[PDB]
Design a protein around this ligand. Structure first.
Ligand code: ADP
Ligand code: ADP
Ligand code: NOS
Ligand code: NOS
Ligand code: NA
Ligand code: NA
Lengths: 319, 319
């Protein structure tokens, strides 16, 4: 199974139907003033671990979320996990605490500015990744800082390869702590903005970062993604979205596809392309977990976009 | 009395303790990803008319709000208006509708990105500014579009001089409609970003705009403001804030001071400086209407900042 470490949260998403880029005037003292009409607020199921596990589960993988929720309002999420067949073994529900809540303001370029009220996420380190059974692969996503660092150290000690996904948690890291996490990581997955921040904080170039992981994956929104590995760099195309509704959690849907590909021995071109497709399926719906394709629908859309069906290598090499 | 036309709304404000400028990377496909920790959400009394009338009332002016609220949840605001002595004569409460709600995400530079659920504001044109009695001065602030345009036409027809304050409503205007509003206006008050947008949409330069009003007032945050009038341009200093907590509604506190100054025949240097002080008093507190100085406290802080007490001209000229 695949351990998915990160936030579990309720999201309130406000989508600007436009591009903040067109509205920023750097020469002015106020560089952006923008008001846009929204409908009634609706809470969505989110959190980085929730979203990544949701995607992995859609593909038929065995996603084991490791995160904390608050007993006061955890129930709808616990019931949703049960209804989808997601194990709650490592979902700790903390007494007399509220679950993480994100107020996400975003545009169609996925420029997210989020006011985050962390609640139970603050105690994410109560879970010990090293103790989780039957894990062959993991991801460490945005979470409480102490919990993020502990998950990287425990997984490395346990010899569980992991994708490091610092995401919205990046500001919590200093250079030494970020360098250390990358040393421990087997793969890193970031978007292009997060990648620049990682280079800046570590003081390492992308070349130096790539030298310390099996793959450096950098997503670029509607431009697709790049996967740098030992023998080359894959240029992964985007899949054309049926419609562009809400990019929140595109990266998480993508990470669900990448984890599935890695577990099943996909080559990077096909793991990347499956990931890229998950992100395009997700963007056509509002909220990070509203899209709900069957595995047969995923495979058909993959073959339409790319010309072949996605699955793991059948080469029986010596390794 | 002074008619204050604009939105009346409940605000939910998320303040980033920092500057979005430092986090925008224009070279990347994602130019900003930022998550910041917030405390529990608290609803505040807002809306542009609410805030401007609140400021005018603090100074001892006679503020008459003209706006629409929704009967479903208007009550706390109606009770607040009663407790502060703000007349509700032109506050229309619409049946089976909800009041405007703003989810404002902002930084310490007052870069506001707002998700606005307008509710009853959509029907602001049910009020007729031309019908309001005993009005010597008005402001037309951000509101429902139809209501904004109607208020400018009715006030002009009634010969009531007004400050045009398009603010967050600016995107609703086209060039012809914006040019027309400026022709009708006696003064315009914008921040520096809104000013650039006004020049862009009308296709007029600041010189051309100034030729069509008695004063063009442009606010510049911590840099103070400029007031361009027939005989010159005042450089209005900022007042150093006691602390910088929340800039939301600084411009509205400033407009309350300007309206007071205009009604009482302040010179532009002193009207500007009173306005500038109102904005500095407001920024030291969270929410647009939380600051509550007495008039004696306002006068003392004015004299500390500027070296004299603020009041209207005592020159009895021929006019
Ligand atoms: N507008 C779009 N059209 C199609 N696919 C998209 C679009 N935006 C994102 N995706 C898919 O989702 C992936 C991740 O999106 P991205 O915005 O880079 O991640 P994040 O959510 O981490 O910021 C992209 O690499 C792409 O494959
Ligand atoms: N950081 C600050 N320190 C002191 N005064 C401020 C500050 N920011 C705003 N003000 C006062 O409030 C006025 C209006 O603020 P501004 O940010 O320009 O308006 P708006 O709310 O319309 O964007 C300024 O001209 C200044 O006088
Ligand atoms: O600062 C944060 N820490 C952890 N999780 C977060 C943060 N900000 C937003 N999200 C979560 O990120 C998901 C999209 O990838 C959203 O579902 C939101 O819950
Ligand atoms: O698009 C809008 N139209 C009208 N009013 C608005 C809009 N966006 C925000 N506010 C109001 O602006 C005030 C700060 O000046 C806030 O109190 C908010 O209620
Ligand atoms: Na490594
Ligand atoms: Na005019």
């Amino acid at each position: 199974a695949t351990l998915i470490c990160g936030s579990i949260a309720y999201d309130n998403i406000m989508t600007f139907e436009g591009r903040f880029r067109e509205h920023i005037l750097p020469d002015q003292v106020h560089l952006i003033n923008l008001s846009f009409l929204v409908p009634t607020m609706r809470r969505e199921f989110g959190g980085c671990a929730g979203n990544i596990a949701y995607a992995l589960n859609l593909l038929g993988g065995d996603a084991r979320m490791m995160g904390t929720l608050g007993a006061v309002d955890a129930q709808p999420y616990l019931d949703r996990m049960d209804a989808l067949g997601l194990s709650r073994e490592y979902v700790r529900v903390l007494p007399d605490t509220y679950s993480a809540q994100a107020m996400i303001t975003t545009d169609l370029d996925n420029n997210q500015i989020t006011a985050f009220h962390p609640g139970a996420m603050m105690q994410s380190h109560v879970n010990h990744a090293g103790e989780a059974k039957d894990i062959k692969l993991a991801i460490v996503g945005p979470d409480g800082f102490q919990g993020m660092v502990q998950h990287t150290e425990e997984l490395a000690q346990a010899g569980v390869p992991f994708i490091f996904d610092p995401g919205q948690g990046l500001p919590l890291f200093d250079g030494a702590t970020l360098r250390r996490s990358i040393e421990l990581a087997t793969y890193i997955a970031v978007n292009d903005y997060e990648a620049k921040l990682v280079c800046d904080k570590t003081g390492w170039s992308e070349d130096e970062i790539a030298s310390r992981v099996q793959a450096l994956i950098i997503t670029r929104g509607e431009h697709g993604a790049t996967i740098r590995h030992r023998d080359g760099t894959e240029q992964i195309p985007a899949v054309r979205a049926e419609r562009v509704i809400d990019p929140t959690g595109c990266g998480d849907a993508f990470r669900g596809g990448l984890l599935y590909g890695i577990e099943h021995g996909f080559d990077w071109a096909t793991a990347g392309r499956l990931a890229s497709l998950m992100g395009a399926l997700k963007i056509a719906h509002q909220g990070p977990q509203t899209y709900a394709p069957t595995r047969a629908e995923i495979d058909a859309r993959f073959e339409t976009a790319f010309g072949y069906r996605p699955k793991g290598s059948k080469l029986r090499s010596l390794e």
